[PDB]
């Protein structure tokens, strides 16, 4: 039986960087042709062929990036997505696939958000779902019209015709 991979690559309605839901999960179509993909950079299992290789933990996931934060998806570096939203392990094995979406994620009705503020460092491969209002000092604020409390989930604000770097990018991360 073929591996289930095509249920989301040819689909729509991807979540944001704070709602990335993983799937269990042929491999030829990823590297052969597929020139519409924005980048093919691949730390780990390398861009070599996947011809009948024995691998486990083939879980993969997808999320929507502003475009300048695609470079932040790499081990051992700083960045708002790595520090707050999505962190990769230092000894990361797997690969990433990304492509531009000029008029695919840029209608009038769209809502994409990122966690700008959270308490402390984040660790790779865990989920932060709660919309608890961030406090600059600590604890909670439970209000908005005061010093020290800010709303954590700020919008990307995807509008068409913003140029490269703010135009939505659908990146899919593979883990091996």
């Amino acid at each position: 039986n073929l591996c289930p991979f095509g249920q989301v690559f040819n689909a729509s309605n991807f979540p944001s960087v704070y709602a990335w839901e993983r799937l269990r999960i042929d491999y030829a179509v990823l590297y052969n042709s597929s020139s519409s993909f924005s980048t093919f950079k691949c730390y780990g299992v390398s861009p070599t062929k996947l011809n009948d290789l024995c691998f486990s933990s083939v879980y993969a996931d997808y999320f929507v990036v502003k475009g300048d934060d695609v470079r932040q998806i790499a081990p051992a570096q700083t960045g708002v997505i790595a520090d707050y939203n999505y962190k990769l392990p230092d000894d990361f094995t797997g690969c990433v696939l990304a492509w531009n979406t000029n008029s695919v994620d840029s209608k009038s009705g769209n809502n994409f958000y990122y966690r700008l503020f959270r308490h402390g460092k984040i660790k790779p491969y865990e989920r932060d779902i709660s919309n608890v209002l961030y406090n600059s000092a600590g604890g909670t604020c439970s209000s908005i019209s005061q010093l020290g409390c800010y709303e954590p989930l700020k919008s990307y604000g995807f509008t068409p015709t913003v140029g490269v770097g703010y135009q939505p990018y659908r990146v899919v991360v593979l883990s091996f």
């Binding site: 503020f117 700020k154 015709t161 913003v162 140029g163």
Partner: protein, 698 residues
């Protein structure tokens, strides 16, 4: 923990949500300016009010972190931009009065009309009206009428509004922990690095004084050459040693002398560089012009456009029915979006303006990585200086020869260089003293050095002394001639053009030195030079993140404003004007005026004196002129407004002269006025209860 561990989070919260609202504000402004119609101005306002209300809401929230306990440069600069450009500490009715005064001044300037004396129904506006008259007409009387009708039917309306505006702006700027509104305009060019070695707000005045004193000989020789060439035309109207009249300078205010080029051209048989026919003959459009400008900017080392620039920015006039404003501006909409809005044509001036606006865009594209508060020029001069200096290299008649715009058989003799240099100096050198004098007048008005009863006297005294320009009609305190300019009536700083010129020529000499240019500075092209592009982009990348002195030091190897680049640019023109002004007088005296030779000196020897004595004296003089011209069977209705008082010393003496009604250029001869005074001598002094000893009429 500490405030530095809260200010960075506060600034990180600010930028990532101010960027969005700034983007919708810029999008609303673009969708209005490209689509002038109804239901278009009613979407900027609520978006602009939303962005503004958020901006002062953050400004109120900003005053929680003092600048003393933070040490790192960028957040300190961001908090310095904050907490001072916020809501003005003023009463609500005072703020409403200030807004009403500004709106009334803008409406008066934009809708003011001047009518002909013979035809009261033929009235002209300023932008499509009197501007054409001052730019094209060579008639002395028509130019005098257009210069006098404006700023008497407009400036007299603007005088009390400007007085209240000055008072309210001084009150507003004193609340921002400044002393004056001129000091508040000098919050730019204000840096600090270490041990108080930064640029002070009072250092700018001394520096521009030094620069103005260093351009005195070149401007004096240019003024002498213009005055010599303004005596072939307008004979018996310009003194060979006096100042130039204010209405014969090519513009309503004497700002740019570039319209005097056909009158003062040397070697008129030699044609100037104009490739308009050679560009419409090869099938050029807006896209080809902008692609050539992009190819020029790529060749020096600057990157391409963002590819949304081509598909979104309107370049020519739209084919469909959609009203636009045809003012060439470069739009930085934010969030990685850059656009240019202009109504271009296939013309050489539009070809240079495209390079100017794309240089502005390349300035805007460089600091996109900076935070939102630092996405500006290092001062208010570098942006326009870069825009002007990127178009200076493409106007050389060697860059055009490479592009095929100029035929290779064209001769580059030493007379066309003189013509080009003189056109540049009429554009560039002729506006530096006007700009400096106007900003000095505004600064001394805001400082309180010029009292409200001496605005016009000091204004024309500095116009005579510094610009070398004399008024043709005397103006008392009722007039407000500074307010007749757009930048003064609309509350705009004006020293940025002065700093633009200085920084532009400094950048030109630096980039020509890097690009290994060998010949004269005015024939220098920085194209196909990647070395100049790197040191240019190093300056371009940083905005307000560094002090402008440090950014200037990295490119021109100097921390100060130097006008030596400007004098080296105009050195062949200077050494040609020194030879031309050999048998003439280089300089001017502040005593001659067009009304000086026909004015009668009146000395007062005491009954109690006030402003009502002037009205009675002018009415008595008008009655004397009426009685004199009635005996010659010439019924002329002389009025109070037909008598002008000049050199008014309010204690001892004044001068006066009489002008015919309906013709401001028709000064009555001094013999006829003296005869009128002699015939009607009893009625002149009996109204004041004094004899001929008190008013002896020198």
């Amino acid at each position: 923990s500490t405030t530095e561990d809260r200010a960075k989070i506060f600034l990180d919260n600010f930028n990532h949500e101010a960027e969005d609202l700034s983007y919708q504000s810029s999008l609303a402004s673009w969708e209005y300016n490209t689509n002038i119609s109804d239901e278009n101005v009613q979407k900027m306002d609520e978006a602009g009010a939303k962005w503004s209300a958020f901006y002062e809401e953050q400004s109120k929230l900003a005053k929680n972190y003092p600048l003393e306990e933070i040490q790192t440069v960028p957040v300190k600069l961001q908090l310095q931009i904050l907490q001072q450009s916020g809501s003005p500490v003023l009463s609500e009715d005072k703020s409403k009065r200030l807004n009403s005064i500004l709106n009334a001044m803008s409406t008066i300037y934009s809708t003011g009309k001047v009518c002909k004396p013979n035809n009261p129904q033929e009235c002209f506006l300023l932008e499509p009206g009197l501007d054409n008259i001052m730019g094209t007409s060579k008639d002395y009387n028509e130019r005098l009428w257009a210069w006098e009708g404006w700023r008497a039917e407009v400036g007299k309306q603007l005088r009390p509004l400007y007085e209240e505006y000055v008072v309210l702006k001084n009150e507003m700027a004193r609340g921002y922990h400044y002393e004056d509104y001129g000091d508040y305009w000098r919050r730019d060019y204000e840096t600090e690095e270490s041990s108080g070695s930064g640029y002070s707000r009072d250092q700018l005045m001394k520096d521009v004084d030094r620069i103005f004193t260093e351009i005195k000989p070149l401007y004096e020789h240019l003024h002498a050459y213009v005055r010599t060439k303004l005596m072939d035309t307008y004979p018996f109207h310009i003194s060979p040693t006096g100042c130039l009249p204010a209405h014969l300078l090519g513009d309503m205010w004497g700002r740019f002398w570039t319209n005097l080029y056909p009158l003062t051209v040397p070697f008129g048989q030699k044609p100037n560089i104009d490739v308009t026919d050679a560009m419409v003959n090869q099938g050029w459009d807006a896209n080809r012009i902008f692609k050539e400008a992009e190819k020029f900017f790529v060749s020096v080392g600057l990157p391409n456009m963002t590819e949304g620039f081509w598909n979104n920015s309107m370049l020519t006039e739209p084919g469909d029915g959609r009203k636009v404003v045809c003012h060439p501006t470069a739009w930085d909409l934010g969030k990685g979006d850059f656009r240019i809005k202009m109504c271009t044509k296939v013309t050489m001036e539009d070809f240079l303006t495209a390079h100017h606006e794309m240089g502005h865009i390349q300035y805007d594209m460089a600091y996109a990585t900076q935070p939102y508060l630092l996405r500006n020029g290092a001062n208010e001069g570098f942006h326009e200086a870069v825009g002007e200096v990127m178009s200076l290299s493409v106007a050389t008649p060697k860059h055009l020869k490479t592009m095929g715009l100029l035929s290779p058989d064209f001769l580059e003799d030493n007379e066309t260089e003189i013509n080009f240099l003189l056109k540049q100096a009429l554009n560039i050198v002729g506006t530096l003293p006007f700009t400096y004098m106007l900003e000095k007048w505004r600064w001394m008005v805001f400082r309180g050095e010029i009292p409200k009863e001496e605005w016009m006297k000091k204004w024309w005294e500095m116009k005579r002394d510094l610009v070398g320009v004399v008024e043709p009609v005397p103006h008392d305190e009722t007039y407000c001639d500074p307010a007749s300019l757009f930048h003064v009536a609309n509350d705009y700083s004006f020293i940025r053009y002065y700093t633009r010129t200085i920084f532009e020529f400094q950048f030109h000499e630096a980039l020509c030195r890097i690009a290994q240019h060998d010949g004269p500075l005015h024939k220098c092209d920085i194209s196909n030079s990647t070395d100049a592009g790197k040191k240019l982009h190093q300056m371009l990348s940083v905005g307000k993140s560094q002090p402008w002195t440090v950014t200037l030091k990295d490119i021109v190897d100097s921390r100060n404003m130097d006008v030596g680049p400007l004098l080296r640019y105009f050195e062949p023109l200077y050494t040609w004007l020194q030879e031309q002004n050999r048998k003439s007088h280089v300089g001017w005296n502040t005593d001659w005026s067009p009304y000086s030779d026909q004015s009668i000196k009146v000395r007062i020897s005491l009954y109690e004196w006030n402003d009502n004595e002037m009205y009675l004296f002018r009415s008595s003089v008008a009655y004397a002129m009426r009685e004199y011209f009635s005996k010659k069977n010439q019924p002329i209705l002389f009025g109070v407004e037909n008598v002008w008082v000049s050199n008014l010393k309010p204690r001892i003496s004044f001068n006066f002269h009489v002008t015919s009604p309906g013709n401001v250029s028709d000064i009555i001869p001094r013999s006829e006025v003296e005869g009128a005074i002699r015939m009607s001598r009893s009625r002149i002094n009996d109204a004041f209860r004094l004899d001929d000893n008190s008013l002896e009429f020198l």
